[PDB]
Amino acid sequence: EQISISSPRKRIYHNILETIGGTPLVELHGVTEHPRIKKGTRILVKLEYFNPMSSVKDRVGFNIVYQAIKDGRLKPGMEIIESTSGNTGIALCQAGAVFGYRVNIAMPSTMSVERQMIMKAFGAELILTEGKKGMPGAIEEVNKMIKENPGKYFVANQFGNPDNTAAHHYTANEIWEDTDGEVDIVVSAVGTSGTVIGVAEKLKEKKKGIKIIAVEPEESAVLEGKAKGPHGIQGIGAGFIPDIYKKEFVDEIIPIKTQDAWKMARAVVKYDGIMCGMSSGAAILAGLKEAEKPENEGKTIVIIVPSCGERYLSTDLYKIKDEGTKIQILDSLLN
């Protein structure tokens, strides 16, 4: 019943990029109080919105740009360019501001207006594309832009760039150390797939039997072999299988309905006080569905939370009001 807040970090950080990563792992309790989830089963959420720009992509924009500069692929005189669903452009704006490079962006018009609003203040340059066409339309927008041109642009290429995936070797080490090697299952909702694959490949170097679970929208279940379809889980469901995706590293794929992802997110902020985004609601409902399986009794389940509900205020995330008690709401999610 005693509660201790966080101790001093005992570091002076040399710039904001050094504050990326080392995100906290937090036990869920409110949404896990359910007669089928057994007491020894631990459900932990890794809160990637503790990154300075509040999303998992901070690690991505940082590693892509910093390696490209160390590489020679980004050099003084070039600009950065990319297509995103939002968070990646914001992470590249952060790295761009620190390193001193200009940044240009293409993104679907349908993504929350909060995302559009962050880019620019840092020093970027935007282009909003058609919703309907989704991430592929953004990508085409980007190709257009480079086509011509010189050897002037470095293209971040977040769906095909292995520096995306490799940034999540740190994510995996943090899960390993924070759980003292006890993690059994990791659940990650998939956009670029750099988190699920980067985490999986680094954790399999640690312990072979860790189960890795990808999550995607039921309405666009492309990893499971379905076609691209309209969905509302912002930040995931790219509509294609990213070139960095490595299926041999993923044990199971869970489809989650858009409405259910949102409703889970509603429940997590109400019963645990954790303000997770839409794709977090998908990941957490998948993880809860794992936690009620009798073969997972006593296991440690780690669920990636990629973003904060506050970047979604303009959406319908917090529109509908759920009826029922806590137990009613959880029953409706699990059945």
Q: Which residues are catalytic?
A: 57, 279
Residues 36-65 that bind a second copy (CB under 8 A): 44, 47, 50, 52-54, 59, 62
The reply, when asked if residue 191 is annotated as ligand binding, is: yes
Site for a second copy contains 122 (CB under 8 A):
yes
Task: Give whichever of 216 and 272 is closer to ligand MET, judged by the CB atom.
Answer: 216
State the first-to-last Cα distance of the chain, in angstroms, to the nearest integer: 33
Surface-to-core class of residue 332, CB atoms within 10 Å of its CB (0-12 exposed, 13-18 middle, 19+ buried): middle
- 325 binds a second copy per the rule CB under 8 A: no
Residues 234-293 that bind a second copy (CB under 8 A): 266, 269-275
Piece of 10-18, 138-146, 153-161, 192-200 that binds a second copy (CB under 8 A): 10-18
Whole-number Å distance between alpha carbons of 179 and 126: 40
Selected binder of a second copy within 37, 56, 69, 215 (CB under 8 A):
69
Give the distance, in angstroms, between the CA of residue 318 and the centroid of all CA atoms in the same chain: 19
From the list 197, 309, 331, 206, the residue with the least C-alpha distance to 253 is: 197
Q: What is Dmax (Cα atoms) for the chain?
A: 63
**Contact between 118 and a second copy per CB under 8 A:** yes
DSSP character for 189? E
- Is 25 near a second copy (CB under 8 A)? yes
Nearer to a second copy among residue 22 and residue 230 (C-beta): 22
Nearer to a second copy, 240 or 318 (CB): 318
Q: Would you tell me which residues interact with ligand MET (CB under 6 A)?
A: 57, 84-88, 135, 158, 191-192, 235-238
Q: Count of residues for the chain?
A: 335
Sheet holding 153-155, edge to edge: 126-129, 103-108, 79-83, 153-155
Binding site, annotated residues for pyridoxal 5'-phosphate: 87, 191-195, 279
Binding-site residues from annotation: 87, 191-195, 279
